Design a binder for this molecule. Sequence first.
Ligand SMILES: CCOP(=O)(COc1ccc(C[C@H](NC(=O)O[C@H]2CO[C@H]3OCC[C@H]32)[C@H](O)CN(C[C@@H](C)CC)S(=O)(=O)c2ccc(CO)cc2)cc1)OCC
Lengths: 99, 99
Amino acid sequence: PQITLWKRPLVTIKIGGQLKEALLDTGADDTVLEEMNLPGRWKPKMIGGIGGFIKVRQYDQILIEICGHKAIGTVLVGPTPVNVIGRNLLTQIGCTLNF
Amino acid sequence: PQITLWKRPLVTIKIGGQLKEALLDTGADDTVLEEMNLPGRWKPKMIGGIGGFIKVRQYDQILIEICGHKAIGTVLVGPTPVNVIGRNLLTQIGCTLNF
Ligand SMILES: CCOP(=O)(COc1ccc(C[C@H](NC(=O)O[C@H]2CO[C@H]3OCC[C@H]32)[C@H](O)CN(C[C@@H](C)CC)S(=O)(=O)c2ccc(CO)cc2)cc1)OCC
């Protein structure tokens, strides 16, 4: 689809078999989701945002469906204020900016 | 134009008579720029993201030229680690997400 930006670009995602709402975020290199349970191994990582760094759980090669489009990539889970879909996955679904 | 998301969506902007590089950020409600001594009145504001909040100065009705496209709106100035063009201005240049 074509998504305008008058409102936050929020979409439904499916991860680990569960539905959630997430923000398409071209300013995020990586995808960061609020605290949740995901199966499989994970390793600790640090990521920095506008206000500092947070500790996240890095899950690699995770299946995630974004607005009906499949992706398999890295998903960071931690105390983010909002579920954000970053460029690592936006590229997989063929997302571009246009004006 | 069309901007793929393999790399950070960095573009040149013109603000207050100065040229800068900034990130086209669909995840930012409002525009946040690196410290710059702009003229005119302003109001204190706190904005939050990953890592917490930072203190910024809110200037209203500021003109920015983004890839030759003009836009006028609120600009937040403070110790941001990156120049971010938010939805308040991206809407004015006709920017959409497409996949
Ligand atoms: C030298 C480099 O500095 P740095 O590493 C951090 O640099 C960056 C800092 C921020 C960004 C942009 C933000 N992206 C981000 O958080 O991405 C994280 C995850 O993916 C990684 O990739 C890049 C960083 C990591 C996001 O797009 C927009 N935000 C809101 C969303 C979170 C929705 C709540 S918001 O900025 O907070 C914000 C809040 C309120 C307003 C007013 O309306 C305007 C902007 C990009 C790079 O310093 C370490 C301390």
